[PDB]
Amino acid sequence: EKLDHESVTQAMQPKDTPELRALYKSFEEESIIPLWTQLGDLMPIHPKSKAVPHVWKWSTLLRLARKSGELVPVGRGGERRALGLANPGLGGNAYISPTMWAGIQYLGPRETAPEHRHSQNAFRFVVEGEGVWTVVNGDPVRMSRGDLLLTPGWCFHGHMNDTDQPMAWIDGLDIPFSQQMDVGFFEFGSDRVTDYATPNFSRGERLWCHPGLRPLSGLQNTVASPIGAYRWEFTDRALTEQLLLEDEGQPATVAPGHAAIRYVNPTTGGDVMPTLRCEFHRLRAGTETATRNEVGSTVFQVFEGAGAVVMNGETTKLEKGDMFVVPSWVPWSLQAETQFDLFRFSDAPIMEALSFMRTKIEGQ
Amino acid sequence: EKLDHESVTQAMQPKDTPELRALYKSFEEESIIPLWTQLGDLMPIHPKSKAVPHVWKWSTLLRLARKSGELVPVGRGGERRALGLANPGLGGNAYISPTMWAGIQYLGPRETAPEHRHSQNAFRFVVEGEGVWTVVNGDPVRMSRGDLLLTPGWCFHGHMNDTDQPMAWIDGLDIPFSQQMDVGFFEFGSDRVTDYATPNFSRGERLWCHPGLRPLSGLQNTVASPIGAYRWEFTDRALTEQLLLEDEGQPATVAPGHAAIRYVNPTTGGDVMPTLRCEFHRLRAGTETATRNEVGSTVFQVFEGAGAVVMNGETTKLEKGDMFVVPSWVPWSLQAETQFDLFRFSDAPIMEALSFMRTKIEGQ
Amino acid sequence: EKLDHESVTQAMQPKDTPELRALYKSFEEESIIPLWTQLGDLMPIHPKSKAVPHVWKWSTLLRLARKSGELVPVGRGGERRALGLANPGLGGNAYISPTMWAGIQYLGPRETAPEHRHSQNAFRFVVEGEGVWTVVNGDPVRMSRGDLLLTPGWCFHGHMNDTDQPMAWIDGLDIPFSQQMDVGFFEFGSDRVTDYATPNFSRGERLWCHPGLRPLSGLQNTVASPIGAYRWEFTDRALTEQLLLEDEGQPATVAPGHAAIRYVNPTTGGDVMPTLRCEFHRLRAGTETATRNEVGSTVFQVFEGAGAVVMNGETTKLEKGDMFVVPSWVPWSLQAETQFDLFRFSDAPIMEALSFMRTKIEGQ
Amino acid sequence: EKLDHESVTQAMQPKDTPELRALYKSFEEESIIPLWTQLGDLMPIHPKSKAVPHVWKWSTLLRLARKSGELVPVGRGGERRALGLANPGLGGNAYISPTMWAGIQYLGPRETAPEHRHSQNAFRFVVEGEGVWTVVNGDPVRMSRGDLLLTPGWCFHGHMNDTDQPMAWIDGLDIPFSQQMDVGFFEFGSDRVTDYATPNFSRGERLWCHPGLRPLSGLQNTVASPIGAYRWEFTDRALTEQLLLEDEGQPATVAPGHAAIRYVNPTTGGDVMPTLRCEFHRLRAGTETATRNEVGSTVFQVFEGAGAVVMNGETTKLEKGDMFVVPSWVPWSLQAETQFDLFRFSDAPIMEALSFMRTKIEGQ
Ligand SMILES: O=C(O)c1ccc2ccccc2c1O
Numbered sequence A, B, C, D: 001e002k003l004d005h006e007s008v009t010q011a012m013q014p015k016d017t018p019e020l021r022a023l024y025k026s027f028e029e030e031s032i033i034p035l036w037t038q039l040g041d042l043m044p045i046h047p048k049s050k051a052v053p054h055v056w057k058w059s060t061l062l063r064l065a066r067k068s069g070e071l072v073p074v075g076r077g078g079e080r081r082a083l084g085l086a087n088p089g090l091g092g093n094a095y096i097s098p099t100m101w102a103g104i105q106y107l108g109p110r111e112t113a114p115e116h117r118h119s120q121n122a123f124r125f126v127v128e129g130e131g132v133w134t135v136v137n138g139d140p141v142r143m144s145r146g147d148l149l150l151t152p153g154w155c156f157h158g159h160m161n162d163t164d165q166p167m168a169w170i171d172g173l174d175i176p177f178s179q180q181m182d183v184g185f186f187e188f189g190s191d192r193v194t195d196y197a198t199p200n201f202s203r204g205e206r207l208w209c210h211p212g213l214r215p216l217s218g219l220q221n222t223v224a225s226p227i228g229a230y231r232w233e234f235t236d237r238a239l240t241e242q243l244l245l246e247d248e249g250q251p252a253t254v255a256p257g258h259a260a261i262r263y264v265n266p267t268t269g270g271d272v273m274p275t276l277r278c279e280f281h282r283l284r285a286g287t288e289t290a291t292r293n294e295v296g297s298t299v300f301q302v303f304e305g306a307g308a309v310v311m312n313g314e315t316t317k318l319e320k321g322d323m324f325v326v327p328s329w330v331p332w333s334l335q336a337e338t339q340f341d342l343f344r345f346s347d348a349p350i351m352e353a354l355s356f357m358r359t360k361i362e363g364q
């Protein structure tokens, strides 16, 4: 119970003879790697990611996406003017964590990003901006400040900026899980979008965004949410109500002065997509969350307010639009200077689906 | 495949001798009933309910509930001034069908109906009225025109009329299933209601009526919906959108010019309660639904508009607030003279949970 | 919390005037029954069945089934020489409890009981006998001492006695639930059986009775078990192992000296059929089970040994093949004089599927 | 639909100026990697693993494990004398595929491999040998020819060879998925095993290996199977019965002359463990399976017989104990010269749980 790989006796250390050396040479030849030279690495005491905790500043992400907007045309080959946050610990891979791409995308005036689909699951989130529609399976979906937009695996999507002003948002994808696991399919669709109309709300939303109500034409459950946009007005209202209910002495908040919602698939009550969990948190000025260790990785974008994240004991101060990653099992807490709003995503549905999830909370 | 109990050969007709008669006498003595005198009754070719299709007029229900309001005080023993629709086929039992109580309840000015709970699941529906709050687990829930209010099994509830004007609504309960199956528990609570406050919306609603959004404090699934009120404004809007989407050539409606929603438990996407399914239908003027045979029983209350129900070939004309029951397997269709809005409930969740459900639709 | 319908104040007792009497007369005319004259009956404090606890002796059931075998031919109309245990509390209905038919069936030498199917779910259990095959969907299934044979709803089945000696067994069916709920469908099949072959084991068994192993051709889950026979040798061995494990200090038994298995659907690990739960219990000589109150009804047939049942405080002594019923919520315990083996069935899957189940155990 | 990353127009190729070069330099500085230089790699048209199909010969694995048995002591540090098959395509990692460790382990006379546990899920399979017991949570489990032994995540286990003769078997683990995903926990237990007793069968088996029967003390579902050993005699019998049923014209086999079982968790009917699927196939002499493309990776060990595997068009001949891996989406078929028995495992439960699974079969 108390020993680690540092502290235990290495009892499988063979005599370094010419025959041993011949046996090891013969291993390499035959595509064999013995367990005993390697045990501690393959099976650590607790998760020890190669991904490192890290913070990206929004002013930095903005300046670089804007410069990218001058110098690089968006179109067919590369598909998107999207800049992926790359974990310094992940050997040059465009992965914010071992499971997830997190990135900034920029669409300049009147630009179109052509239609494609991929098994990989995706979502858009907007800290600031208006002007872009993303057309998901032919259904135009407005993008605005505070909106979560979904694009589940295997759905066609392309984006067009219907205005003379640029917008930026963030993408989250299971791109990295999907590459390492070999699950990727990809298909090119129309070079434009298939509908340039700009309805204020999409068809999915007009069918599925009535609370506690389900169309009779939609009685089959789905693996991904059929809600295309989760609009800021509902998220804001939910969070306010939880805070109001707290004031009124009623249970609601997840911890004192900590309001939070999880975005869900209305057909099951579960996660928006099989691999990706989205949440939105609002902390009262002064709130400090209890330190957590969680299996798998999570990313936050600050939506509004000022505060700090503490990861491994290290406080970093945070401003609007800043992003950070918390690798598997790294202890973390948030601290609200003002009322602190944040957008969150994680690979938790993968961890929970496979029974790998664990949670340590300080104070219990 | 073609034979019925009329047409088949009775090959188990014993010789009527004194010994046979002695054997049958000996059966009665020993609490034995032979199968062979009775097979066709116990196992019909298709469902053949003792419940009969029937229509109750709202003007009749109103007049009688109003007279009940003059002559009978509401309070402790009988619990509610509630008049239960009794199927003429069900031998004097207060059952609209073998599974369900359907009834009108009337609360006069400033009256209180004291708090109780029961394993039996319940809901309220309001064709017309305002003024009553029903307090569910201490949480006051406004009742208004078009609102579905829930009261799942084992939750405390009592009603108070906060106005100088009477209101009527309808109750649905699994009272009859529950009596015949022996599942009933009952408990007396406070003689008043435990909160006389009249918020415009309840705590459940302020936590759970944000579309696609789930509090993090409510991540456990429930057997019954935690939404206390499903308010007319959302039901009306959903139904309008489905009709609009139909006009725009988009899939949405359940059949042409037939819009419909099912009321659901947001934690699972399934039925409001284990035994009871609620739905709301809006038909375009002129729409006639395809004839259906369904296992189990269903009740509709006309909410708005004029039309007809056909049950067993028999058309009955329907007006606002009228109720009807369709027993198991009785063929039925609705016909809309004007735009025809109806509230619906059924025992279908019982049938589906136990794999007894079947559905015959004319044209397929 | 402490008041019952005896103890509470009747506050809805209207003044007995000619107008009140006219209002009540007008109720009967309009198929209306008021709640207030009836509340305590519809909603008892705890379940209060019309079914009564009762014991049927096997010597009595045997003598009557044997006499039935002389006087009544088995064949087409009545379908089966089956004698149903009728609860004295259930008004002349052939119901052992509100949900379940329990009955003895007798097939004389070389008799055939023709093929039929019905939505109603069924099983056979054999305390003593050999000689009968029951052909389920064309698949001959041997019947022997200690065997549970299944016949889920909508499967064809007919029985033939391949010997010059009579056999008796018991049937359990959701016949009574199904009649009162209107779920019954019925269909006549072949007048003989469709296969007279007498394999020692059936096709279902040769595919599905290998522990922890599932054919790749059978990867879809089923609502009912595809195992046609649960043979005594496995049931006996399981129960022995649990007793052995208990001796060895290992967890296994359900309570001290109480071994028990539940018969299951290998495709889900759940109940054999949607409405019916089957179990088999073996108690050590001297064991007395803790008193239980359970929602819904249960029937036991003594398989081997001597003991007693206590129901409502009343001990009745039990011998091999005797049957008893325990109505919903009646307190019950078993007492083993010798090693006491019993077969059990219940409507518990109905109660649990609809969240009506409750359980009170003395000592917790 | 027809274009790939070779064939499409690269429209995001910026002008190679000093400012562009400065922008790219500034990306590296800020831990940013643009999508457009990389799109085709991250999102291939269909899965394109770095893992390569490959075959390891059993005579080679045996000779090297035997030599390892002379030169390397087994004990505390390295934990196991286990040789992991390393995919030539996976950059020096001890991974047979991106998700799975597949390896040979050798325990010499009277050796003990000390107790540990790890979140990572494991199983043992034995083509040949007897003499070893693996003690899982204190419960000794015999290992013999043809046996699948389970060791789900977080269960203590250590192995001891109770004989004067060496045994080898194979291990499968989600070691590689678990390393890349950061889910690993590890704990050292006793230096010996906690029980040296050698029962012919384990406690798990004596409780859970009765077909269609479930202890009442084990009514909670488990995430992993509680069956510790799936013994060759049941696997052999199942496969024989399927072949017999085929001869008798009865459905059973998965394809003509192709018999197959999946090893399952009896509590759910699903996979043995969350990440790992085990199966066993028996092909008639002459059988050739239809070419399949499946998402995720699979490993087979030949158990008995002679035949061939075809992967990417390439036939390799196979003998007893040989192993091969089929990476995600590589087309594969087996060809039986004699009756061909094989053991199989895969990451399919991961793929299916996350909705990534796809299947192409030649002829449909
Ligand atoms: O469609 C989009 O907006 C989008 C954005 C970012 C992406 C990053 C990696 C892989 C695919 C992406 C993708 O398809």
Ligand SMILES: O=C(O)c1ccc2ccccc2c1O
Pocket: B080, B082, B101, B103, B105, B122, B157, B171, B173, B175, C035, C042, C043
């Ligand atoms: O609480 C209520 O409003 C109510 C209304 C009608 C009822 C009819 C039968 C049994 C219980 C009822 C009940 O509890």
Ligand SMILES: O=C(O)c1ccc2ccccc2c1O
Pocket: B035, B042, B043, C080, C082, C101, C103, C105, C122, C157, C171, C173, C175
């Ligand atoms: O098929 C059988 O053996 C059988 C036995 C008893 C039955 C009692 C009531 C209704 C149907 C039955 C039935 O179909």
Ligand SMILES: O=C(O)c1ccc2ccccc2c1O
Pocket: A035, A042, A043, D080, D082, D101, D103, D105, D122, D157, D171, D173, D175
């Ligand atoms: O316990 C065992 O037998 C065993 C065998 C092989 C293993 C390969 C990689 C990681 C852990 C292993 C492990 O725990």
